[PDB]
RNA sequence: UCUCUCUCUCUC
RNA sequence: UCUCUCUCUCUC
RNA sequence: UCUCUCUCUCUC
């Protein structure tokens, strides 16, 4: 059944929206002030800090960073008769914790929290990619397209586990491997137990994310090493390099800024009644009638800023430029020639140069974001029955496709990773960059509500460049 | 997190400084005497001898060199009413070992020891380059710029492993190869095991230091030889010759003399509270308000001595003269016309000719010393994505950059070193001596604390000579 | 080398 | 990820 | 699945 999940997501988004309304009430902000991305970012990171129990518990035992008992940050921006001002106002954790407490009818709202962490992951992935950590681990910065949800902490649950990508998991595993190489953390203490439990859980998440059998079995053989040394390091690097083409269907949750949700909730559009979806038309239908303001530097182009924020909202920073432009309706500028900077504003930059303006979010078309992979993998490995069932009682043979039956079982168990690298490189060679994917699907029009008739895109515009980076 | 490392380095430097204060207390030296480079050198080499367990353990079984149970050296210089005197005072190992024992709150202070070895490496590299060992190994003395940390012993840890350079590792590997050629040390005894363990660890350090993939794979194929004969000898020589241009980002730790640290600690500038950094502005900000005295021969120019000691402190002996002068503010004299000698003073030279004077260390500007390489390598091999991730569930192809996918994996494994020498010489030909490096970075002013605005240097002063040697 | 291996971000 | 990993079905 | 999982029988 899908009605229950729809009601649950509608309920928790209604809670988030009415929390945002409560914030707009308590901050004494004007109508325009509540349509700002920056203040939503500030309050939302404040919520992240308040609800992150582990960092807090690390902090009350560590009274450092000067003024840090329980209050952090808070750069609220207010419009003064056309000009702008920034104030560093500090808020307690317990008060706003309880404001959430009645902002969700007595619940913890963990799903909402995961929504905020995921929307932060999308903003960071859209703005800045961490080539720095990649090169730190020795890992090639050519594969930044594997950095989905890198800024996410491990505190996120299964819903948060859905969005964090393959390459980010390679990075976090490499971090723990380097730590275990530096010192003997693998002893029989409770620390070793929690490390191996986390390691096996993360490997299970990995094997869930992949699609082809060969990579799944190689990963299953990865955690056989009770004492991970150096071989699994290049094993995981090659895992990422092979997942370049055999990508895992991780997630692309379409999280939206708190201002848009709050404006919708304030207008009386209760999400529980008509339902809410995070994947279909629904996150789209709020945006063509949404007004968003933000601050811009006197050199930044607002036209680029609108495209970038729509990227971040729809987590399309790692999507191809051609289809993103087709859905948007206008050409999208790659990261190479963007005359803009990060949407976050520095704490030291001067107050005079900021100017507020409206953000354009309307898009001509819409499409469903499925958590799947390209059809090319199913082209490499076709589909069909392998077994048969006797319906009539007739004296006949039972046809069994035996050579694939051994392949599923792997009768002769794989010796090491290398034998798997062999046929996975063979599959990579079988791959082609002209393999059309997602057959039977298309882009629909905004007037469509039940996905009745799509239109297939056709891109013949030479080599404009399907690479947002470079 | 960077606060913990900052606190740790501040703590161990505070320990070193208060050890230096304890030494100034116990030596009964005057105020000027503690501002001398020579006495700091003597006590510091004494500490090196006391804390070097391997040489000690080689020595108590070898009672040679006459008076050598546990006491070595100690040429302390004292000012007598304007004149100078030198005394050979001998100190025990255990007493000063325990003085360190409470000089660091009960710790071994291995990081501090590594700091002293690295600062010795910088002094030796600044003063004298070992062309002698290069020619001994048959290795061309044109490449002395690869002699970073040559005097370092193998006892230094990972922090010490960071600073010892590529050419020095070529030299130590050549030494072990010559030893294994002379006699069959590669037998199945425990000695062979420790040799191969050290050899593979040092090769791992090498492959960590390099940047380009081709050299890394060639090095990975280097240790495939279970019995190293003669081919890997020219293989490593060519490795150094290729690393001439494709240099490895080894390290340039800015270690400072114990007198400067001790003066700062005595004044009450506790490093733990405000933090310490070895790489940023911090090692610089102590020096413009630091007073240093040293002995000089009646022919040596003190102006050259100040520049040389600032070179040694900042380990800029292998940096280009133009930028070093720009940061210093005054022209730097190359090794060709330096009317000075080594900062260490001979044990046989007469007492009458020594004269003490102040050392100039103040510099107009400051810059960050990153452990990176020139941008020219990234110009030869550009940057960008290689793989893509499906965000929307659309029937579409997954574009994979296959020809580089084989290149990362090396599907057809390299036959020997020669096929790699081919394209590495091709890359050397692609190299140009006009490739501007370190884009997006610059030199900042001393008034800057957060690296807000740099100024890019522009050198058009013909051919003054960017070669400290020759 | 988490005081910056490149596309730039105060954000640890 | 039950708003679609492929053969297409409004059927939850 | 008593309209036949093997040695064959209309026998219920």
Residue numbers in the entry:
A (entry chain A), B (entry chain A): 21 to 490
Reproduce passages from the article.
Influenza virus genome encapsidation is essential for the formation of a helical viral ribonucleoprotein (vRNP) complex composed of nucleoproteins (NP), the trimeric polymerase, and the viral genome. Within each vRNP, the viral RNA (vRNA) segment is encapsidated by the viral nucleoprotein (NP) and attached to the heterotrimeric RNA-dependent RNA polymerase. In this study, we established a biological tool, the RNP-like particles assembled from recombinant influenza A virus NP and synthetic RNA, and we present the first subnanometric cryo–electron microscopy structure of the helical NP-RNA complex (8.7 to 5.3 Å). The RNP-like particles are a tool that mimics the influenza nucleocapsid.
The helical RNP-like structure reveals a parallel double-stranded conformation, allowing the visualization of NP-NP and NP-RNA interactions. Each asymmetric unit (NP monomer) is related by a rise of 24.3 Å and a twist of 57.4°, resulting in a right-handed parallel double-stranded helical reconstruction with approximately 6.3-NP protomers per helix turn. Close examination of Laplacian-filtered AFM images revealed grooves pointing toward the upper-right in regard to the central axis of the helix, which is characteristic of a right-handed helix conformation. Combined with the AFM data, these results confirm that our RNP-like particles are assembled as a right-handed helix. We were able to visualize a parallel double-stranded helical assembly at a resolution sufficiently high to describe the conformational changes of NP to accommodate RNA binding and oligomerization into nucleocapsid. It is important to point out that our helical reconstruction is straight and does not fully reflect the highly flexible nature and the inherent dynamic of our ribonucleoprotein-like particles and so the vRNP. Like every model, there are limitations; for one, the reconstituted RNPs form a double parallel helix as opposed to the antiparallel helix of native vRNP, most likely due to the short RNA and the absence of the polymerase. The RNP-like structure resembles the compacted state of vRNP; however, because of the parallel helical assembly, this structure can only provide meaningful information regarding the intra-strand interactions such as the NP-NP oligomerization, NP-RNA interaction, and overall architecture along one strand. We did not observe interstrand interactions that would be relevant for vRNP coherence. To propose a picture even closer to that of a vRNP, we generated the antiparallel RNP-like conformation by flipping one strand by 180° around an axis perpendicular to the helical axis without any steric clashes.
